[PDB]
Symmetry: C2
């Protein structure tokens, strides 16, 4: 019948997607003219040292350093955590997948707290794990009482927690995180958006908690989503096995060089973060004035809006796309009544608001 | 105790590797002045279009195309196979792993034919599969009779086969491949080195054999090992599930752009391949004259040598490294007596032979 595992054959058929360069040409626009606010990308791009370095790669024909030593030394300086705790991956996506495949046997359970990042449930499915959903409360805070109860009853092995959360941008309180860390479970804290907040990274907590992992990325604030480079802080008892099991070469020389180059320009990284945090405030006020949008407070580089007044989030998203403006809408049941608008340049917000006005 | 799956806690401890730049300083040389013949890399590098493109990436801050549409159209044109058969990976390494993840449950069996590429047994271990070893014969050819008997006895799910093989460079004769394809098993044919041979790629066979996958890479002939981009031809009944199960974004925009750019210059790709093939013959004759090396015939961009009695292969490799030439030495018991010498520029061969004469 088939060589493919039956569990994977039960996944929904792949729905092809047209690149935004294809939407661009279908609208008769240049790709750079699309206002792309649907993936939390940083439209300022990375510091100028990155493109200078990418254009002068001296050894493209040599395998990259599988230990990412240069970058891990730079991340140890950046984070204050010793490099022996730090692993680099081809995006934080690779590290989420690596953790699941190294921790979860077939049928093991993870806890998820929706609405949250869709890759946790996708990676659970492809890795043969079951998901226990413990929905967030109406203000998007964790229901810690329910997490404790399901963890005691069903004995899941892992819980993935995003802070600031995707898609609403709220943060997890220290006491809530510590309560969950008391449970016999591996806690993966995803700090993909932490730089847009004034909250300190918890990378250093892995020295005191051997059931905590903290994940970070260059994809968002550092403007390197296309290059695929992220990293995490891991307890020594975990990372010793991840070194043994990980693929050697998924992090390309272009990823290594770009991340190192980005860290050479802290002024640029601070300034672009400050520009996006400032625009987040302006965008919030502008969305709040739209009669059919109810934005939520956010510590990230995006704003979630409840769509009200009988307006359909899918039609709104499709109408904006026809005008050359991309925002995020949701197919799943937990998020079908919302849209998520990423923070871009002020000019991007202006185009978005002008298009919303024309649709209102 | 540990959160790590039990089968992974039995993997051998990780052995750290000195990075190439650090090794070069330790040898007292600029990295560009090291003669690096230990990893089958192409020292001519990729076509000039690649660094032109890498220096002008428009959208580094945007996620890459998870469907690799531009590259797959270019690969369809290059290969003669329709794009619906073609998947792109973060190196051929990603596709090797992806196939095992999608086909093998823990405890399923896979056939391997050592000595061969170490990643098949590594990926099998990480995925919890059981390896059935059917060793190659002394001339490194497959033992087809034994593969057939073992497959009928043990009912493994898949077999990976390298052609040209790494480390000796022999090719699987097409009649042996067909005999294995006649078995109820998934055959993954790894053509990482096929461009260095005069044998046509079997990608086209995938249309007629729904138990055949053919893997290819940009890391070797095309000089893009650092950028991490490979691809494969897959039966339609398989690739439809791989699309559903694969990670979306492991192939970076730099990988997509560099592979497309390399394919813009078939003149360069053919010329550097021809230069390496020519140098392979010259290198083979020179190594053969060395009284303590027994080179094997090869269709790849490397030559395996058996080191004759009384010479320590590890000391040989370390002595050459001290003189600025890197060759491949093996720790595993199967290959401990052999060294593998990659083909480089003619001047690299000259440096290597000068160093050998000084030993
Ligand atoms: Na409103
Ligand atoms: Na000889």
């Amino acid at each position: 019948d088939s060589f493919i595992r039956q569990h994977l054959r039960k996944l929904a058929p792949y729905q092809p997607i047209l690149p935004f360069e294809v939407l661009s040409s279908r609208l008769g626009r240049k790709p750079e003219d699309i206002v792309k606010l649907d993936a939390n990308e940083n439209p300022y791009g990375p510091p100028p040292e990155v493109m200078e370095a990418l254009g002068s790669i001296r050894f493209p024909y040599v395998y990259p350093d599988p230990e990412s030593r240069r970058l891990r030394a730079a991340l140890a300086q950046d984070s204050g955590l010793e490099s022996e705790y730090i692993l680099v991956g081809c995006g934080a996506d690779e590290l989420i997948d690596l953790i699941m495949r190294c921790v979860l046997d077939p049928g093991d359970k993870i806890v998820d707290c929706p609405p949250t990042f869709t890759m946790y449930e996708f990676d659970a499915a492809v890795n043969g794990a079951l998901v226990i959903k413990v929905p967030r409360r109406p203000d998007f805070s964790l229901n810690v009482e329910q997490i404790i109860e399901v963890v005691k009853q069903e004995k899941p092995k892992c819980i993935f927690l995003t802070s600031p959360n995707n898609p609403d941008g709220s943060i997890i309180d220290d006491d809530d995180l510590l309560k969950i860390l008391e449970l016999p479970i591996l806690v993966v804290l995803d700090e993909a958006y932490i730089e847009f907040s004034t909250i300190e990274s918890k990378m250093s907590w892995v020295k005191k908690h051997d059931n905590l992992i903290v994940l970070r990325t260059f994809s968002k604030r550092a403007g390197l989503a296309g290059l695929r480079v992220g990293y995490g802080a891991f307890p020594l008892s975990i990372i010793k096995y991840l070194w043994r099991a990980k693929q050697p070469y998924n992090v390309s020389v272009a990823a290594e060089i770009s991340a190192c180059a980005a860290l050479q320009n802290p002024t640029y990284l601070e300034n672009v973060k400050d520009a996006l945090v400032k625009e987040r405030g302006r965008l919030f006020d502008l969305l709040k004035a739209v009669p059919f949008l109810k934005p939520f407070p956010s510590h990230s580089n995006f704003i979630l809006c409840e769509v009200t007044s009988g307006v359909d989030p899918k039609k709104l998203k499709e109408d904006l796309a026809e005008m050359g403006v991309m925002i995020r809408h949701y197919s799943n049941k937990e998020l079908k009544g919302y849209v998520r608008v990423s923070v871009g340049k002020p000019e991007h917000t202006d185009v978005l608001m002008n298009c919303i006005s024309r649709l209102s």
